[PDB]
Design a protein around this nucleic acid. Structure first.
Lengths: 58, 157, 185, 51, 49, 148, 222
RNA sequence: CCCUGAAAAUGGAUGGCGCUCAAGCGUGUUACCUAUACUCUACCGUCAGGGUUGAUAUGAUGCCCUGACGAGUAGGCAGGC
RNA sequence: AAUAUGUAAGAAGUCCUUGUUACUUAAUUGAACGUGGACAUUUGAAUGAAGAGCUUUUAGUGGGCCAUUUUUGGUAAGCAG
RNA sequence: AAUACUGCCAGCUGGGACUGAGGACUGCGACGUAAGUCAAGGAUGCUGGCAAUGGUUAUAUGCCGCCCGUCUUGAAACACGGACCAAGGAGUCUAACGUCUAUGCGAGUGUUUGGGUGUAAAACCCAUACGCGUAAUGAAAGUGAACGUAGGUUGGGGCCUCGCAAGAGGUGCACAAUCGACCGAUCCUGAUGUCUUCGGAUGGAUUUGAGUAAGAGCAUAGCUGUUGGGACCCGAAAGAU
RNA sequence: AAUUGUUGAAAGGGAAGGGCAUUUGAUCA
């Protein structure tokens, strides 16, 4: 008893009936996957600038 | 059986353009690569280390990572019914600068200059771009251009 | 036939009055919809909307949260109001004088606030005191702090607290969580 | 409660446009244009009948 | 058999427990019987506690 | 229950709300947890990971008596004393007299470090203590005690 | 409580002022129309008499009427047809002409008919079947008060200004069209005049470009 | 255009009757009939946007205004006998 | 080639000045995050939007077919793909 | 010059069919110098006949209409079951649960294991223990969450101030991501001291958790769904005593 | 109720049965 193997009919309609939107862009992107040294110095730079801002403006 | 590999059905994809064989010209390597810049992808078959997949060919994305010799590009993929980002790394070869970002930059620079020199006076700045409006009225004079009759050519064997 | 671009006779997706048959809550809801209809301040509308939330959509607010909110400058002379419940926190020993309005008040929290010098009033007292909501401040409890919010979103490479009745060893710690026994998540 | 169609009901059309009275009085719908006579050039006449 | 995200449960109900299930429907009756037995013993034990 | 169930509302419908293409036959996927590595492996892998395999030791005769070790963070440390004396001892700070806290009587055998007690002397008596907790009590002026 | 007489007098004075403004604006507009038509006619006559040819500019208006139903429609043309507020069989909408809109209609073209109308047809259609969209409500246009209260930002206060903006595309065309709800209207009185509707005007059918022939049709169509 | 080419089994199909400057064939122009198709109006229900504690007067889950829509197996939810 | 397909067409932007870093440069030379300041009509191509985004639950479904175009096997098939 | 054709009239008029919804006024307008009138946000006036119209059913007339339920892409089929009527008849219950909703209490919550009492299997009251949560991470020994206003930045409803409004400044709960801080495991470097091998202070990680970062949980009830039970009802060819 | 006998009415050129609307007969406020 043979049967259907593959069919692309109605897949486009099935998926497209629910609205497909662009991925919600984030003003602060995920930083995962970058070179480790960039993180190791970025954290120090952020700490330094935060402490400088705290000392300057309270 | 079945064949769906990393380089399946790419006989003409990873093929060097005619009269462009040999080593890669030494100008794409010295381009300064940053983060947040709009850029596209075009694979090169000269080096067999770090090629983009068949889908990623001809796709444009934003750079997020920089390394010794590699870039990180965000590419949206269509599977199912959802847009999802994908982080991918290629060598400095198969990554070509896109002129759309440069066009946007020069347009915004010109717009800022025009806005400044207009607000200096404030008269019909017309900052927005206009599409191809229909042509206005025109006058055609038949001086030396008298129309001549056109007749269909009879069928010729 | 008409080419419709969306669902037909679809509900707004927002609740209209609690399913609860509390006649006191019904009367208070009626008073607040009168306030929203016959005034212009957004206070009445936001109170109307937050009145509709269920028991899990109205998480309790501790007295510690109220004290922390009162620490901000310019908010000391503000009528703190929260929709839901007020619960005493044993981790706070000092409480500044204030005036808190809520649906129902815990006995311990009420005792603490009256000992600190504050007073407790209901929603109608707040409405009759500040119909337009003058010098007020509204809190909402932590909705994503429940025991079930961590449970949703289950899947691989996400780690969202699967559903196991009991916690202990050999309990969803075998193959599927460790690389040494195959793959990890 | 009921939509009244203009151009068939005088009052609704007059209310919608106050120019109804002046348009009717001056009969602007039938205006006689200036009698100007311009003769086309001989080139236009020749090319009209050019075969 | 296997379904969506529900916790794993092991219900040990597979033997012939239809004839073994016992229900304490006589809670109040047993309470009053114990009280009556205590009272009868108290009337019987003499002033001994 | 019987009035509020939708089986009554399902009366008249041929399949009683269970599908016409596939009838409600017996258990088609097996009885209980039939299959965990062949056809139900997807649900065992992406929803219930960690079910198959040995993880650790073999502890014979596990008695839940030697393992009694609760947590008493310092934040909920003043709840042990009665309400009538809590305020009067909060106002009265002195080292000549100290308040004895017997957390063992409360049922907690270990003091854990969190809560930031104000600067008042306090005496506690616990089976076990933590380093940061020890420093936190001793910072105000008190000191923990070890009993068995 | 005697202020009712004073407020009535104030309302009457405001009305009278608004009607006078509308009347003078309509006089100016009709002067513009007559001057423009006389000028274009005289320009054509001068070009003819001077041994030259006058090139008429592409019309700055187009009227689109759907003739195709909602069944057996591909996704892309279905949605772009609905994108111009064409969601009803035998419905009309106003579009301004530009390369984007020209290609928009060209993709739509299989399923609709279009043409360039005159002033009288727009006037009659808006007077007869004028319906608007205020807070997503289908409020019929029977008084100028609602349009003058809702369109005071853009300077439109009477339907005559709306008609002038419709015929003469200007800075206030997009939201003017957004106000105008798509018109639902009955089948043609005299019929389509062609046995096979699904034929191009070059093939001899109602469907297709109508140029100025759309005026007579829409006169019978409405 | 028509014809020979062109022969299958119960008795039959441009539906048949019939039709020959056709009621056959190609094209052109008006008139005529209709679908649960389109416009307007009346009613029902759903949805959405609103008004109505200044009352004796109750059902504000009550009353009223406006507009849009109304097909459907398996199945889901709600209101009722 | 056509068709189809990706990106961008702005306030999450542009520009001026200068604070941090254990990265880096011969080097205040670069990079990221910043502080202060300037640019709201026309906020940066057209159209539209019974509003958009997000979370939980689960019924039924996992045997298809036909129609235009492209096209495989087969001479062909109301054949299979 | 007229005429044909096209388009316009906020030009007039004749004839016919359907509709009468709303129910003291509120508004936009016209006529009228002015009273007042009107075709101006839905029909009134007069007159005639009777005290038959109309509802149900049978027949007749013109048109249409294949036999109910299931399997199936495809049913009315030359596929399946049905001669008829009357009575019975098919997702119920328990244990542990998931989401949601309602109630009560609340960092606590749950009387009914039991005791006292009782108008007596009804109802009322009650002490200690006990289940769940308030701390998690490691196989285990073990350890165990504030450098800060319980951190920095963004979008943020609301609130406060200025501003006629619009808008501008401040605070911004909940939520969304990101950078940071602390806790457990792992890899590390190793401070005083010392039962010379014990002790693990301080500083890190492209590592890792079902963590903390002003608690939210417990008890009951209700729809739906899953597991085990005979499990929506009925049906095997078999096996054992 | 299935089935059947009588009385009264109605219909009947190889089915009956139903819907759209009405005449006719009977009945009905």
């Amino acid at each position: 008893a043979k049967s259907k193997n593959h069919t692309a009919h109605n897949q486009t309609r099935k998926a497209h009936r629910n609205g497909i939107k662009k991925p919600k862009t984030y003003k602060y992107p995920s930083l995962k996957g970058v070179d480790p040294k960039f993180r190791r110095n970025h954290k120090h730079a952020l700490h330094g600038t935060a402490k400088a801002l705290a000392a300057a403006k309270k | 059986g079945k064949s769906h590999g990393y380089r399946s059905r790419t006989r003409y994809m990873f093929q060097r353009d005619f009269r462009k064989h040999g080593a890669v010209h030494l100008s794409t390597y010295l381009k300064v690569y940053k983060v947040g810049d709009i850029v596209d992808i075009k694979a090169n078959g000269s080096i067999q280390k770090g090629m983009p997949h068949k889908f990623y060919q001809g796709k444009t994305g934003v750079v997020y990572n920089v390394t010794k010799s590699s870039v990180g590009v965000i590419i949206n993929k269509m599977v199912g019914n959802r847009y999802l980002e994908k982080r991918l790394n290629l060598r400095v070869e198969h990554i070509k600068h896109s002129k759309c970002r440069q066009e946007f930059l020069e347009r915004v620079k010109a717009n800022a200059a025009k806005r400044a020199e207009a607000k200096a006076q404030g008269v019909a700045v017309q900052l927005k771009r206009q599409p191809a409006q229909p042509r206005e009225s025109r006058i055609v004079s038949t001086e030396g251009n008298v129309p001549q009759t056109l007749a269909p050519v009879p069928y010729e064997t | 036939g008409i080419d419709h671009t969306s669902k037909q006779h679809k509900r707004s997706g927002h609740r209209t009055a609690p399913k609860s048959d509390n006649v006191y809550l019904k009367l208070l809801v009626k008073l607040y919809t009168f306030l929203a209809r016959r005034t212009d301040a957004p206070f009445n509308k936001v109170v109307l909307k937050a009145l509709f939330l269920s028991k899990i959509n109205r998480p309790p607010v501790s007295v510690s949260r109220i004290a922390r909110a009162l620490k901000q400058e310019g908010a000391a002379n503000k009528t703190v109001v929260v929709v839901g419940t007020v619960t005493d926190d044993a981790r706070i020993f000092e409480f500044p004088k204030t005036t808190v309005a809520a649906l129902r008040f815990t006995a311990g929290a009420r005792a603490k606030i009256v000992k600190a010098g504050g007073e407790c009033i209901t929603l109608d007292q707040l409405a009759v005191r500040a119909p337009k909501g003058q010098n007020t401040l509204i809190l909402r409890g932590p909705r994503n702090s429940r025991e079930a919010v961590r449970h949703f979103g289950m899947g691989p490479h996400k780690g969202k607290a699967p559903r196991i009745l009991s916690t202990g060893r050999k309990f969803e710690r075998a193959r599927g969580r460790r690389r040494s026994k195959g793959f990890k998540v | 409660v009921l939509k009244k169609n203009p151009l068939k009901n005088k009052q609704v059309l007059l209310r919608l446009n106050p120019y109804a009275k002046v348009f009717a009085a001056e009969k602007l719908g039938s205006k006689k244009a200036e009698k100007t006579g311009t003769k086309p050039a001989a080139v236009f006449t020749e090319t009209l009948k050019h075969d | 058999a296997i379904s969506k995200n529900l916790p794993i449960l092991k219900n040990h109900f597979r033997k012939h427990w239809q004839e073994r299930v016992k229900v304490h429907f006589d809670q109040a009756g047993k309470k009053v019987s114990r009280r009556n037995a205590r009272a009868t013993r108290a009337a019987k034990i003499a002033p001994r506690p | 229950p019987s009035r509020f169930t939708k089986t009554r509302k399902h009366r008249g419908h041929v399949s009683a709300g269970k599908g016409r293409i596939g009838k409600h036959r017996k258990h088609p996927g097996g009885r209980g947890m039939a299959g965990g590595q062949h056809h139900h492996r997807i649900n065992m892998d992406k929803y219930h990971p960690g079910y198959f395999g040995k993880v650790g030791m073999r502890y014979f005769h596990k008695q839940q008596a030697h393992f009694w070790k609760p947590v008493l963070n310092l934040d909920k440390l003043w709840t042990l004393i009665p309400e009538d004396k809590r305020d009067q001892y909060l106002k009265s700070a002195s080292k000549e007299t100290a308040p004895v806290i017997d957390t063992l009587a409360a049922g907690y055998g270990k003091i854990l470090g969190k809560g930031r007690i104000p600067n008042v002397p306090v005496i506690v008596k616990a089976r076990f203590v933590s380093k940061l907790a020890e420093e936190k009590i001793r910072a105000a002026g008190g000191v923990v005690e070890l009993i068995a | 409580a005697e202020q009712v007489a004073a407020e009535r007098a104030a309302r009457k004075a405001a009305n009278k002022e608004k009607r006078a403004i509308i009347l003078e604006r309509n006089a100016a507009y009709q002067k513009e129309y007559e001057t423009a038509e006389r000028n274009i006619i005289q320009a054509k006559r001068d070009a003819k008499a001077a041994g030259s040819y006058y090139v008429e500019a592409q019309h700055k208006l187009v009227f689109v009427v759907r003739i195709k139903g909602i069944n057996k429609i591909p996704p892309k043309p279905r949605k772009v047809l609905q994108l111009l507020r064409l969601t009803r069989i035998n419905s009309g909408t106003f579009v301004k002409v530009t390369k984007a809109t020209l290609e928009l209609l060209k993709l739509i073209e299989p399923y609709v008919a279009y043409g360039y109308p005159s002033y009288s047809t727009i006037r009659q259609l808006v007077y007869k079947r004028g319906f608007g969209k205020i807070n997503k409500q289908r409020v019929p246009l029977s008084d100028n008060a609602i349009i003058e209260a809702n369109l005071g930002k853009y300077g439109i206060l009477s339907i005559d200004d709306l008609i002038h903006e419709i015929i003469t595309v200007g800075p206030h065309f997009k939201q003017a069209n957004n106000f105008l709800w798509p018109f639902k209207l009955s089948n043609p009185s005299g019929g389509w005049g062609v046995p096979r509707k699904f034929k191009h005007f070059i093939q001899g059918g109602s469907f297709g470009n109508r140029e100025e022939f759309i005026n007579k049709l829409v006169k019978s169509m409405n």
